[PDB]
UniProtKB/Swiss-Prot annotation:
GO terms for biological process: proteolysis. Belongs to the peptidase M4 family. Ca(2+) 1 binds at residues 57, 59, 61. This is Thermolysin. It comes from Bacillus thermoproteolyticus. Ca(2+) 4 binds at residues 193-194, 197, 200. Its EC number is 3.4.24.27.
Amino acid sequence: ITGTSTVGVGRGVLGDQKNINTTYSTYYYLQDNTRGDGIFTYDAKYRTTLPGSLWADADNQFFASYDAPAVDAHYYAGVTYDYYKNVHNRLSYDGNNAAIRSSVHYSQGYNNAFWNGSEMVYGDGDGQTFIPLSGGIDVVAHELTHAVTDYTAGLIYQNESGAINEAISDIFGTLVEFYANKNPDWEIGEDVYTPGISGDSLRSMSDPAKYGDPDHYSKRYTGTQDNGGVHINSGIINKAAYLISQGGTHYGVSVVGIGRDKLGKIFYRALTQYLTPTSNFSQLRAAAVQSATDLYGSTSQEVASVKQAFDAVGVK
Ligand SMILES: [Ca+2]
Ligand SMILES: [Ca+2]
């Protein structure tokens, strides 16, 4: 759409009010001209055909229940774009300011969200297992990071490489949640998962085993489900990343934490300079060690912590 940039206001899935960047041309559209080539949000009107219609609103006010998921998808993609730009100096997922597109209200009672190779897609949830998935900034940023991976390392979605791909998305989705300072934690999806149950979440990076995911290479899943356990074995890497950041003792191996910022720097460098489509866990360790080395010197504590963390999860 071609029009005048403006700012509207609405309420997101959690009931919080926020301002969003819109475009005016007869209607007010969810089109944000302030970031790269634009952030565009679409209505999939409960169907599976994509992208759907660009979101149009008559009065620039987005307080309807039906508007909530679009408000958050649009807003949270802006935050994610901001994180990448400000923190890592990367312009959009492709590094060249590609437009960011998302569709909401996908299907009916769809309990998932994903990057499809071209855009983001978010279900509304069935209202029991999930509420609309774009209400979770970690979920939005996790999905958008899959686009960053596609343009960079290109990790194939299966087996070890697939679990790497997943862990990267959880790591960065969590880093973005801390960046926005939105009640940050080391859990994934807590804000939109099981509305009736307080205290849980989809996955935990601090303690993957809490939800039955492995926290040591010895416990890795070797079957064929889930594309070879992409959502299971990611817990091993997630746990290593938690330890690099926060520190701790895990299976008797002690790790000194080096903090979130460095965690993000090391990982981004690994992802963008060293990983390849077929990278395995062991190659990830090497990439991470090398990145830390590059960044901080080989006799650095940073390097040391990266080694200790992978040793702790049994990755050689
Ligand atoms: Ca979280
Ligand atoms: Ca819950």
